[model samples]
Target: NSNICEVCNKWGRLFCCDTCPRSFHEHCHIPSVEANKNPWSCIFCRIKTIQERCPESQSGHQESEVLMRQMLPEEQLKCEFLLLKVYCDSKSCFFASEPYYNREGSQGPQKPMWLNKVKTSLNEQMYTRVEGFVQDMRLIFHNHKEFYREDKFTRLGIQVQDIFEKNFRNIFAIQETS
Candidate 1:
């Protein structure tokens, strides 16, 4: 049920996941797509395939442990790549220079997140460990959940999250075998 991005609702050169009917614009995708590599598959489809094929497991804290163990200066490109992947979303244009117009109470996200902050951090060399940068991204999707809570646009945020996390695992090849 996709075409005009469920996130953008427009049409253009779309990349269709080979395992599914859904199609997404290159910018709207996480692969940093060059539009190739035959039989390309989307994140969710890929996840499902693994789910069906494996029978898998928690392998939980491993991702955090693995990332923290690795050094950071060593890996600016991957962090930068994440920023670009997120920027592709249409909602990313208006840099929230500050927190979204929050009521500023317990009724919303205590801490805010946005495209600008993450990008600014990378350029300003404010981030060192990959774990810290990664958490900032986690902060993003959670805010959309707590702040917007139930708006239609919030769902897009959720989609970006799925895209972001999936790519996070892929870019790092962070698989914790079952």
Candidate 2:
């Protein structure tokens, strides 16, 4: 017997959504994983899904990239800060920060110690990337909405396809929560 998705009934890679836990083909998930070596939440159970679904207010978003654009810096800052707080609250921070503890000469001092320092460093990176992402999304959406015809959906489809390929296959990503 072969594994099949309870919902889609498609066969390929078998997985379950963390929230729904509905068996699904990995490709059926928004971001599919190939050769999943560890436990993972299907796209339906991913945090990005929540972010994509919930918006701060006026911005419209049917996807994660769109949500990132819709949110303001302060809003995104709050989200990142919340993650930092949660990480600190958890015991993992103690272990994760260990690597940052040993800083040698040339990098300027031992650096700002403590969890806040880690949070700030992380926030800086996220803020920069998200900001740039928002800018790019604006451009893409602008171009898409204004004048796009033949293969428009095709182009977008290709992009959507590539996101999973890049994020799941190339980059190491932990399964998210819905």
Candidate 3:
């Protein structure tokens, strides 16, 4: 691993994360890194650790969804945590880049969906409705399944979707009519 800064993509007094290959400049990383710490862990990596210690469903993350309302503060936070879970399991990169465009050359992702794109939209507060966020996430799972249906890597996406659905219903406490 070149250990390039994940945020700045430049090498300058970078703090190497032992948990992952992602490095970050002291200032480039949010909350800033302290030089005193020998090995630093990125926020995403930290989420992995947090999840292991604390289970999600037990956290009481149910939400009100009368007519499938807007994403509440709690909903957004839970969704963020859920994304971090997917990021950690996906080798933190499967959905990070545009694979079809890179591999297929002329053949690009028809809708061009990626995990980073959805995370950016989440941080930007671009999705007004909660379903809007759900669709984007589902789109990623669909793209992954479509492109690599029989590949060994497809299992990861399938497993992640199972986890995603479990958490989604838990986070919103959705009723399963089926």
Candidate 4:
């Protein structure tokens, strides 16, 4: 006799695979999905398979990874070159494709799908921003030294400091650095 799938509730001839029970198609089971064998396994079982082995599986990691990727835009993260590698060991996150890997050696069950794509663009942006700052600071530092000798910088320290603070306000976080 064939058993009906608990979830789909279609009965016929059904057989469960030893390795992946509840994975059998109705046809593969005993007779078919139509008549020969009926598929079995509950929706929960299927969901469990999908979410299997996800790194964040226990803590809702795979779902979190998807939300983060969609909300933040994977492209932007890659542009930063500091993109996180999204990983989920959950079986539910399973796909035929390979995982998104970070060259920086990030590993484990966490997903870090967002990554930089254009190497040249990131390098260019880095060079432009960093070099621009260095150039401007060099001139400022040079003039500051000159002005100090002539007493012209006596009251300009605050002005220079304020300029730097304003420009770089969002460049980095305000964490303690003692």
Candidate with more favorable, higher lDDT: 2 or 4: 2
**What does candidate 4's lDDT look like per residue over 1-178, in tens digits?**
2254432346655555433445334422211233332445433343345446343433422322322332122222222311111111121122213333333332322321111212223334443333333333334434343434545533353454344433232222222233
**TM-score per model over all chains:** 0.56, 0.28, 0.55, 0.23
Candidate maximizing TM-score: 1
Q: Model 2 clash pairs?
A: 45-178, 46-177, 47-177
For model 2, the superposed segments whose C-alpha errors exceed 4 Å read 1-14, 22-31, 48-127, 148-178
Which RMSD values do the candidates have, in order?
8.0, 16.7, 7.8, 23.5
lDDT for each residue of candidate 1 in 1-178, tens digit (9 for 90 to 100): 4666533567887777777777777655543344467978765565555445644432344676646744353356566666655665665554335564545443656777776677678768777678778888888877776766566767766787887877777655576465
Q: How would you encode candidate 2's per-residue C-alpha lDDT over 29-129 as one tens digit per residue?
A: 32234465456654334544554566443233244543345335444543342332233223323323323222332232222233334344444554444
lDDT-best of 1 and 2:
1
Where does model 4 exceed 4 Å of error? Answer: 1-127, 150-152, 166-169
Q: Model 1 clash pairs?
A: none
Give the lowest summed-lDDT range of ten residues in model 3: 58-67
| Residue 153 alpha-carbon offset, candidate 3, angstroms | 3.1
Instruction: Give the lowest summed-lDDT range of ten residues in model 1.
Output: 52-61
Candidate numbers, best TM-score first, in rank order: 1, 3, 2, 4
lDDT score, candidate 4, position 70: 28
